[PDB]
Design a protein around this ligand. Sequence first.
Ligand code: LMT
Ligand code: LMT
Ligand code: SF4
Ligand code: SF4
Ligand code: SF4
Lengths: 96, 52, 157, 188, 69, 178, 115, 318, 257, 56
Amino acid sequence: EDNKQFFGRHRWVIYTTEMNGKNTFWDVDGSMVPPEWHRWLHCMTDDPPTTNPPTARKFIWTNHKFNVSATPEQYVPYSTTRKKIHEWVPPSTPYK
Amino acid sequence: EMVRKCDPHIGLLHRGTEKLIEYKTYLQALPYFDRLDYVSMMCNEQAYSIAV
Amino acid sequence: RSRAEYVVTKLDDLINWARRSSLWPMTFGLACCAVEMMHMAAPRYDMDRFGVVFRASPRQADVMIVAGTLTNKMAPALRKVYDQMPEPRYVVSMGSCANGGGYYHYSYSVVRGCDRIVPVDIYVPGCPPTAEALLYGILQLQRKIKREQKLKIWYRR
Amino acid sequence: EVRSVFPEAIIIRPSDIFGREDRFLNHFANYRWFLAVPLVSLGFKTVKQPVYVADVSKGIVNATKDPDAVGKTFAFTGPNRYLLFHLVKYIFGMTHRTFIPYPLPLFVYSWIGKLFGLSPFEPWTTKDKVERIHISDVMPTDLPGLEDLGVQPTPLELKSIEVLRRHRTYRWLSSEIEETKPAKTVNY
Amino acid sequence: MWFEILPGLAIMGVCLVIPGVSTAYIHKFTNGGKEKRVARVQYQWYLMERDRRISGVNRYYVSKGLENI
Amino acid sequence: TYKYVNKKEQESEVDMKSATDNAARILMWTELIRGLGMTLSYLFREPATINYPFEKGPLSPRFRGEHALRRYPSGEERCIACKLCEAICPAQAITIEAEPRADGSRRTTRYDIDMTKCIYCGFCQEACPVDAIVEGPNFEFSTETHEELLYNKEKLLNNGDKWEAEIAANIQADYLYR
Amino acid sequence: MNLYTVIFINILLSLTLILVAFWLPQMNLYSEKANPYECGFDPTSSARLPFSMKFFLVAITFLLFDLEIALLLPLPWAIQTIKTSTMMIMAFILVTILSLGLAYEWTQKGLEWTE
Amino acid sequence: MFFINILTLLVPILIAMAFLTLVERKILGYMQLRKGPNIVGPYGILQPFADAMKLFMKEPMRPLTTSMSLFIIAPTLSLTLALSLWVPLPMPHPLINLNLGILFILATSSLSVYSILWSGWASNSKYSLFGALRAVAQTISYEVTMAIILLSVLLMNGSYSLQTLITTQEHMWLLLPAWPMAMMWFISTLAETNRAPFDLTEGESELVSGFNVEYAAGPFALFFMAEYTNIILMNALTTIIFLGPLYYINLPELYSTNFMMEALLLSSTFLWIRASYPRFRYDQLMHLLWKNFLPLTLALCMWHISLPIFTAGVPPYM
Amino acid sequence: REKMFEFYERVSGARMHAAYIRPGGVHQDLPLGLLDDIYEFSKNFSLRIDEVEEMLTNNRIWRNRTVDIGVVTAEDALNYGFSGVMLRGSGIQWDLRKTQPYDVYDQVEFDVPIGSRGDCYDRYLCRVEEMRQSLRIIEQCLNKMPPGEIKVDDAKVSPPKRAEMKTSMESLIHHFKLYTEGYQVPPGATYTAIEAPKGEFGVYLVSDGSSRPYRCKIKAPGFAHLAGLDKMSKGHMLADVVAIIGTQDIVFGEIDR
Amino acid sequence: ASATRVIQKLRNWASGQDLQAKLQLRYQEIAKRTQPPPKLPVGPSHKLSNNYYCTR
Ligand SMILES: CCCCCCCCCCCCO[C@@H]1O[C@H](CO)[C@@H](O[C@H]2O[C@H](CO)[C@@H](O)[C@H](O)[C@H]2O)[C@H](O)[C@H]1O
Ligand SMILES: CCCCCCCCCCCCO[C@@H]1O[C@H](CO)[C@@H](O[C@H]2O[C@H](CO)[C@@H](O)[C@H](O)[C@H]2O)[C@H](O)[C@H]1O
Ligand code: SF4
Ligand code: SF4
Ligand code: SF4
């Protein structure tokens, strides 16, 4: 931070050069910012997560993930419901 | 470069808003008014809110 | 691999870098989404500092940003100007309307997603996506172009 | 070899396939760049029965569902046979380009194909391409065709302009289909 | 800030001084250490041709003083 | 009350002084010089450009971004498949199916949001009686395919598990206005 | 020789750039790409049809005014004459009649474009 | 050695042109409260090279209605003529020393319009024809006064030789006695280079892209390279005619350094002007030149014939 | 504009399509500190207008492109269906906020800019001055902002507060029904118009008694304005037509719907 | 804000305005991005008596 800069330039992040096994020396993007810092960096609050940490919940991701589009980790949609109609299964044994 | 006739052909952004609103509740139709004069969004809302 | 393969790979990087660094979108915008595109060009985001410059001619454009709703009456014209861009060319679909019809998906007059008309490289969600969200998608297109391997694939043919 | 590991395989045998992105009508149309069109024996000893690309694909897609297609060999040919001379002349008639044919022995022609074949990009022609242009299509006998798969062969005369209009100069761009005299056909 | 425009300007400025400077130096190198002679009129051309003829080496710019007479 | 924008037509006589001032203005381009002065004054102003993506545009806790499905502090899902969000969705972007869970709970088996139908209006999160579906703060989720934007329940619950720390803090900041 | 040499190099450089630009890139020719541009819709006619010129009279006036300056461009040599008064009168008369010609065309509305 | 001298003119001028594309985009940006290019290289200094490499790697257009010979010739002619305009420029010593160097400039510059005319016609599209016919009107507008403006100035020079202008201004800028002609000359060079507020042959808000609308890739780059080279040329010419850089026979490089500084400044005002004004209507450019510049240009030509006679100030022939 | 998008996003969460004004009031109350930031923006904006006026207003090139371009007479403007600045540019003294006021427009002071020549230049001057009069209204809104609730206290129309929804049985029922069925509107029809920034913006809304509109016809001011482009462009060049499209101030979301 | 006094004079003179008094860039004059919680009032129908819906 530098609060002498005008609003918009008064906060910034220097991204890591490696995240989740990806080389980010040149390939950085906004999705690398984890949720606790995303709130501070977008000025949704004045309080950084160092002095104002978020609530701890057991189900919250411990490892942030950036945008994984067009990688083997990309999301692929699918129907989450099970089969509705059930076919009759013909007998295995013959009939004469 | 003298203009003898202007024939404006429109409908290239006709999206059938007015028909779609007939299938919406009054609250559901409100956001369609943001997207009319989408440079004066809240004024469009205000017109529809006053009418309702 | 070999030194001929190494040289080919470095050439891919160079030509890829040139196209990354000088992306010229068409002056082409359809509805409210185009307003946020103006805000990406405006001073706060200043797309021109990344090398992104609007040109009105499809012959002088590299990217089409489909910024708004695509109607049936507009669809042939959009296809025409896409076809008249020289290659290599890219398409960015911007906003729910272009992405899949959005609020007007069920209309008699609307194309349910511009990817029924042109191939799409990046889909930017939102209604409208913010100027920043669009900028993020443009930077995602650049990284996609960074991954192109056309010369390596030519060498291995 | 394919039938030795997949004995029920459907085999599709098309003649030369014409269409917007073909290497057949576009190939001969592009002979204009060399001013004169060589043809072995002037194209009077070669018979071609070219087939439309959308007919082949339609037949291929019909063969994915046809119960009677399994294990068979099909020959996908167009309706009409042509001598290579009249076919090329028709192509130049449709492009409205000056057609200047001249005979060239095959051994000289193959050598030119080898030279063009040295391109490290996509060769404009090869020796094999020259050989295939001058092999006659085999006369139809026995094998089922496109009609057996529910496809009526499209004549070259109906579709050639969609391929060949881009090979015209501005003077002839708007010339219609009927201004070009159709090619003469053979029965052998 | 505006002074970030200057790197491009300095490159422009250097590129626009080279032609003038390089031409002046190449002239002196190829004209015996002197300015290249300007023959606006036929009289000046005549003097150059006479200078070339008396030079002994077929170069107008090699000058001959009183040591030659 | 009204005012005239271009009625300054109190035509008067012209002195030599004013005629010369008019002459100087025409012949020496003085108002065109004032235009150059204005653009020159901007040249020496600090530009308003931020250094995206190292810097970001300011946002507020109310910002409507990528959707998520939330939990109670125990880990139990908040959504109880009431379908109020589905009913109100002006784009019909939500598709829901539900049945009794193995423990008898009223829970969804399908919860889909077509992100390419959605208009990001926030009506779902207003309508939800249990703060289950929310629009989170994320706006950087552009994809390379259309299919990646057809979110199912697993995706939406992962967004909730991914973004809850920021989502919870934004709700704590705004819920008294709701 | 030198002027010929540099202009040939200028021609040579321009033609090399054209050859590179036409033979280096990957091509993909098809009809819709190469059709003339007109904002996404097809042209309704040829671009080779007559295009009216509303400033045609100014254009042919320019032909005469261009020979007037040709008569003025020897003035740097003419001011060297001993016959200074004659030269000055000829130059003054030449400029004045050209001004009167422009003044007449101006008052006849010859500089106004046709509608 | 003469071939090395050609390189040390052409190559630096082409680099100066490339970086003027960068300077324009940054100066325009900062006047618009933006930054302009600052990523592609340090402070954007590789952005011109990226644009150049992109364009020459792009598919060049082969439109079907086009008459192809003139289509190819026009951009080739454009860059040739732009480079040729530099060979007689004395900085302070020219590559080619011409007796009638000013008349060479006018003839070469006047042939340059045909690249616009033929490209627009050859493209055989409506928006390109519109751009070509605006070029016809543009030349009729400014060419009527540009040579008379030059004529009056050169009655103090005494010749058409560019190198003589250096000696004419040994003690004083020609700006001082000729500032009214300098003002009219400056507006004429904007129109002559098709620059704003007279950027009418391209005028993108009206004709999409005018004369070059059908042009892509490397052929398009030649028109752009020719336009930016001409902007530098016309301002360098304005510098030598009216702003006589300081000349000392024993310090030629002092002239070159001073010439560059003034030429850089005059090129900056071209970019400054573009950022400040709206566009003229192309009939209004004709009226500006024929009903304002031309009367004053004719009066001042008569005045500058009159001046050396009644002050006994005729310049020398040689 | 980017700073004003932040006011939109701070009240509604969206920079543009806020959906913030609803029948019954507004969706949420202003966040604490928003009025101060609107005041900070407002006190500098007139200088931003002055700079733009410095570039254009007296510029002879700008005047050459807009003066006597697209002249429309008062009578034609009325018969062609024009409204807003397309009337006031021709001297017609009409503005719905003064003649047919809505919300609290009869409680604020401002002037209506009136043109004299009916051309593009006069309409540009009217719009510049309308921005200055908007600042004048904004200042009064900031000082006169009253306390209290921000939507009608009538839970058959406006949804109840979330805390009530989660405590009281009536509030939950009314919340449930308002977000599913919606409120029923008694049968009838109204033509309602406001002075939108582009002109009179109208809705002819027919209710059949149910919770869905039977018919909603939208009156876009630009629909009549564009229909008058051929009339306004007579005896003008292609470059003038580019100016006249701009002078009508046209958005095709509203013309096409 | 960080312009030197020389540049401030230059841009003030060039524009004809006092730009330093009305900068378009925002500094510390704006609201804090965290605020105290609100407590909003209730409307006129929040009454425990004399509030029958049929009268309103
Ligand atoms: C004495 C005569 C010697 C024998 C002459 C033989 C000439 C035959 C020329 C064949 C054409 C080569 O010319 C080149 O062909 C390629 C692909 O073939 C096409 O080139 C382009 O268009 C097609 C369109 O689908 C793409 O498939 C192709 O990848 C692309 O490069 C053009 O048509 C032409 O650029
Ligand atoms: C209808 C068209 C009207 C426009 C044309 C009007 C032309 C009339 C021109 C009148 C001016 C002539 O001005 C005349 O200039 C000459 C020199 O040039 C002066 O001549 C003087 O100087 C010259 C040297 O040049 C001496 O040799 C001479 O003895 C002496 O008189 C005259 O004293 C003056 O009268
Ligand atoms: S996606 Fe939303 S903002 Fe974009 S054009 Fe469609 S309705 Fe407008
Ligand atoms: S934000 Fe609006 S459109 Fe999107 S899912 Fe929620 S209710 Fe539906
Ligand atoms: S997300 Fe909320 S509103 Fe939607 S079904 Fe679940 S509980 Fe009901």
